[PDB]
Amino acid sequence: MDINDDLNINSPVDNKNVVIVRARKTNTFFKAFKVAPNIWVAPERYYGEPLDIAEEYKLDGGIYDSNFLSQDSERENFLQAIITLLKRINNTISGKQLLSLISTAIPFPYGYVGYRETNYIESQNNKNFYASNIVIFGPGSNIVENNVICYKKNDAENGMGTMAEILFQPLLTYKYNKFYIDPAMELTKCLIKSLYFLYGIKPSDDLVVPYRLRTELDNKQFSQLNIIDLLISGGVDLEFINTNPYWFTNSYFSNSIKMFEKYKNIYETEIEGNNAIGNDIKLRLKQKFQNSVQDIWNLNLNYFSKEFNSIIPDRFSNALKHFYRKQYYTMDYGDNYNINGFVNGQINTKLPLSDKNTNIISKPEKVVNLVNANNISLMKSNIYGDGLKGTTEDFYSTYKIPYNEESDNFPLNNISIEEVDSIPEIIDINPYKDNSDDLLFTQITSTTEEVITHTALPVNYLQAQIITNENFTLSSDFSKVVSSKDKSLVYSFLDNLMSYLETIKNDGPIDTDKKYYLWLKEVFKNYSFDINLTQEIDSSCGINEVVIWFGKALNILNTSNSFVEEYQNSGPISLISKKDNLSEPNIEIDDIPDSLLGLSFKDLNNKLYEIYSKNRVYFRKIYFNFLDQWWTEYYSQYFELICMAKQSILAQESVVKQIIQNKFTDLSKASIPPDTLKLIKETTEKTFIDLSNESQISMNRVDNFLNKASICVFVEDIYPKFISYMEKYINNINIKTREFIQRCTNINDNEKSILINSYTFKTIDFKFLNIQAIKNFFNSQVEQVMKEMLSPYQLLLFATRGPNSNIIEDISGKNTLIQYTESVELVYGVNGESLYLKSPNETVEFSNNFFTNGLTNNFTICFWLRFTGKDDDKTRLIGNKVNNCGWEIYFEDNGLVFEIIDSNGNQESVYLSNVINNNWYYISISVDRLKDQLLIFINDKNVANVSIEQILNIYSTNVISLVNKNNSIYVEELSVLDKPVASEEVIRNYFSYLDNSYIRDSSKSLLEYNKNYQLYNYVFPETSLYEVNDNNKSYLSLKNTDGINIPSVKFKLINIDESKGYVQKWDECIICVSDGTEKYLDISENNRIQLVSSKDNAKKITVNTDLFRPDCITFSYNDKYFSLSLRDGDYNWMICNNKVPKGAHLWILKS
Secondary structure (H helix, E strand, O other), rough: OOOOOOOOOOOOOOOOOEEEOOOOOOEEEEEEEEEOOOEEEEHHHHOOOOOOOOOOHOOOOEEEEOOOOOOOOHHHHHHHHHHHHHHHOOOHHHHHHHHHHHHHHHOOOOOOOOEEOEEEEOOOOOOEEEEEOOEOOOOOEEEEOOOEOOOOOHHHOOOOOOOOEEEOOOEEEEOOEEOOOOOHHHHHHHHHHHHHHHHOOOOOOOEEEEEEEEEOOOOEEEEEEEEEEEEEEEHOHHHHOOOOOOOOOOOHHHHHHHHHHHHHHHHHHOOOOOOOOOHHHHHHHHHHHOOOOOHHHOOOHHHHHHHOOOOOOOOOOOOOHHHHOOEEEOOOOOOEOOEEEEOHHHHOOOEOOOOHHHOOOOOOOOOEEEEOOOOOOOEEEEOOOOOOOEEOOHHHHHHOOOOOOOOOOOOOOOHHHHHOOOOOOOOOOEEEEOOOOOOOOOOOOOEEEEEEEEOHHHHHHOOOOOOOOOHHHHEEEHHOOOOOOOEEEEEOHHHHHHHHHHOOOOOOOOOOHHHHHHHHHHHHHHHHHHHHOOEEEEEEEEEEEOOOHHHHHHHOOOOOOOOOHHHHOOOOHOOOOOOOHHHOOOOOOOOOOOOOOOHHHHHHHHHHHHHHHHHHHHHHHHHHHHHHHHHHHHHHHHHHHHHHHHHHHHHHHHHHHHHHHHOOOOOOOOOOOOHHHHHHHHHHHHHHHHHHHHHHHHHHHHHHHHHHHHHHHHHHHHHHHHHHHHHEEEHHHHHHHHHHHHHOOOOOOOHHHHHHHHHOHHHHHHOOHHHHHHOOOOOOHHHHHHHHHOOOOEEEEEEEEEOOEEEEEEEOOOEEEEEOOOOOOEOOOOEEEEEEEOOOOOOOOEEOOHHHOOOOOOEEEEEEEEEEOOOOOOOEEEEOOOOOOEEEEEEOOOEEEEEOOOOOEEEEEEEEEOOOOOOEEEEEEEEEOOOEEEEEEEEOOEEEEEEOOOOOOOOOOOOEEEEOOOOOEEEEEEEOOOOOOHHHHHHHHHHHHHOEOOOOOOOOOOOOOOOOOEEEEOOOOOOOOOEEOOOOEEEEEEEOOOOOOOOOOEEEEOOOOOOOOOOOOOEEEEEEOOOOEEEEEEEEOOOOEEEEOOOOOOOEEEEEEEEOOOOEEEEEEEEEEEEEEEOOOOOOOOOOOOOOHHHHOOEEEEE
16 A cells, blocks of 8 residues: 555655665764655665675675675565565555554654654754664675664664664565465565664563474583564464463563653653644644554454464474574565465475575584494484574573462454554654664684494484485385495385385386376375375373384384384383473462551451462462473473474475376377376376375374374473472472461450461462363364365355345355356355356356366365256256366266266266255265265265266366356355365265255255245155145145145244244244135144134144254144144144154254
8 A cells, every 4th residue: 555666676866755865873874765644665685794705704695695686676576576565564454554564653752952753864964863773684695694784783672762673584485384485474574673772672681581492412402592583473372381370570561651652752742732832743743642562562463464474483482593504585566476476375485495505504502413333424314403502501590489469352453544654754853963873793613523423313214205316216114225336225104115116117108198097196195195094093191193203204213013002111211312401490489468467357367368379370380480491391302303304205295296296207208299297297297196195295294293292291291290290289288278377466366377278389289281282283274274175165155245245255265256247146055145047148157276176186075956957958067167177966867977087088988866856965076086086965964975086187178167158047056175075974965065054945945934834744745735624624634645635734934923934943933824814723532623713723843853854844832842643534634743653853844
């Protein structure tokens, strides 16, 4: 929105939106572009950070490059890059709100010996003055180095605020596992930081909390992380310090709220409404103060990861440099990146690696040299540092958990954007001369250990799965791979991929597309056997879905003959390298009040409860400290494995893909036709992709598994230790609480008796272990945002009759394009609005990249359908049958036909009987390419399973088309899954859409009041209910001697509420029949239903229904439901009786 899109890098200096201004107070000056109110861009290197720095000084994982941002093309790219990320941040309610606080968050001005501001730029005539809160630069020394620099450090600390400089790198991004991180999200991180600088609450440099324990190292050593980054980081880690209660604290918060107030007050008292002052400023101050310190603190990347839909790491985000060999991709705006986000999502958008990846510094914390018995180097493996400050030493020891105990969810909604975009530009700035400090380069060295080892490490195993040889074969013997003189071996635990590959070793060539598809299929299905091969087991800590290959990949408990049995053996604890890291907490001194010594019973009673209060609260505090250490010292190690195991599956995938690439590189040279290959190729790209889908699944198994084990160790290993410490504290407390009560002069013998007993502490006082909320730690915002982007729905079709308008969208959150006739109307269907096609040419086309299907993709199509369909001849209905490939559902004979076909002409067509009646039918087709198996489910029964093992390449268009010629069709809740389906979910999904509290007809359509339905019993299906006179009246029967002269009966429901349209369960009703008059139903003293012509005789029956039978209701009275009388005339009379068979409970209203 309010972002200036306008400037090319080549816009000249105009003294308005394009200035050349002085950097601090130096005899340096740089070029700048106003993108917004008080927000500028400096599309060149940061000035106060040398460009070619000394090698002795280059840090690990930097890319240093003096020729970066040197060029104009880049300077432009970048200028355009920033503007872009800024606009992408603006299509976001929350982020536009953020940026508006940034616009309006001016640093407070200095006063009378009228008002003089800190937040500005001087020009190089030094007489023109431009307001600025933010300036976004290119990188300083290192080019993957992001950052926020204070203009006047002390102004940033004192409650005042100061201009902020951002160094940014928008031209590179990196992968996190299997998806690319979103650079806009990283800018946001920085904007967030500068609010502290604009507010004047930058936390003191030594307000740092422990982050991760350094167990690559020989002693107890902590990586520590400044409070500010912890908060703005969000993710899992602050969930250990943001606890209720807060266990850790500091002068900074209390003081931050203090000095905020003073500065809020100076505004209130002096600045607001002073007519020497002026609106460009005082208005913005009002706006700076409509937000609190507290708001800015509880603001961070969580709330935005949801809002942007970025996955960005949630565990150990700050120390990733240790866990991750980060990889760098070149960034194209605005083609792969829109005001939308990466066009294609974080997952698909496929970016180019950057040439700079090589210049990336590798200064390992240590180098693991794997040497054999003869002490020769086999392979040397690097172990990287996280970057952070180090101990030294122990924090948990040193920090005294304060004796003194002194919600929300979303942070910037206070800020009204009408209100903000109304305030006139600050134009008259009166400069405070001394607005800036002189700046500082710090620089430092790395020192790296070599270690010799005869013991292969996980870090070695990992290294063993990357390819040395352009020509190569797999192997499961680590040493065989290392000791390849070749070295053409590469380690692999894909035991079956190799098993199959070794068996086809000596066969004929790949010449048919048929022979290739076969192979690719087996390859792929083999990789799936392998990579997600697992087994569930019993620990005390739950059932745990164990990764069967885990041992063989990182070489942990691989020392057995079998991994899985040995995790059983040793415990979750067995998997990590440092197991004794826990460190007694510093707790609180020994006095209960002295002026309680002389109070009497009922007063001392309720103030010993004050002691008890603070105590039970303070136990929680200790607990928290312990948890933090679990995480810090133990989970961190479980994560150590996680990333390794994760990298491992990805390495494995990559073997395969190259194996596959080299098989098409074989394909042909060939007999095969030019355009034939275009397909084999598209297909394999589709298959290469299918593998990745599969690989995610493996990474999740490793995640449940290792995360579980992580908590397994909290329950079994850390917790019992908490118990020991805690009764030490309480037994000791109890000594001293006994001795206080007897020091009491003013309490009686019965006060001594019952206060001793009343206020003592025992073992159940500190049993806090909640394993579920421990497990809840892990579903961070990101791991939730992840849930969704990877979900099996490629489409779920919503539609609403919107504000005088018709919205037909896709709730799945993918590509899925809906292209249709404007003439398509929406009618209530099963549970929401059903697509109504009048049946003419009226066609709707769904569009999604997935829908092209291919060789190895599994997928399910479900949808509701009601069909006013007609003739005996075959008619296309829904399908992606492109020129004789793929699949279609036809109309034919009295049902539907599922036809499914490959590029070779092989087919299983499958006739589904009973569909063309217009009763609603929930069709589910599940095609499993993994198991070669076609399942079809109509409503809640599975109607078919069929072998498709003769079916090959079903590759078609990216469009699944719903046609509906001649025959109006009702379609609702149309879905496409990328998983094949089990009957359980069929039953689950059937009854989900299906129970809404409303009642139905036997066409599964909605039941409304006042409609002429026929009634039948569940017991007697197609014998119509009828009337007959025999005993003093007119009765209700069914004719089981057909043509003993009774004819078909007409029902209608009627309501006490004149307005009410549609029938609901636990509703009240009057049953009517059309005979001679309106006949109203009545239960007699024989409890036999009989038709009366008398309004107040009519019974007020309650309607209810069966939750397993979709189309069925019941009619009843006060616990006596309506059923069918014994076979009688033959006549079966309507009875309200408690002694006949229960299977006559069920009534279908069919119109």
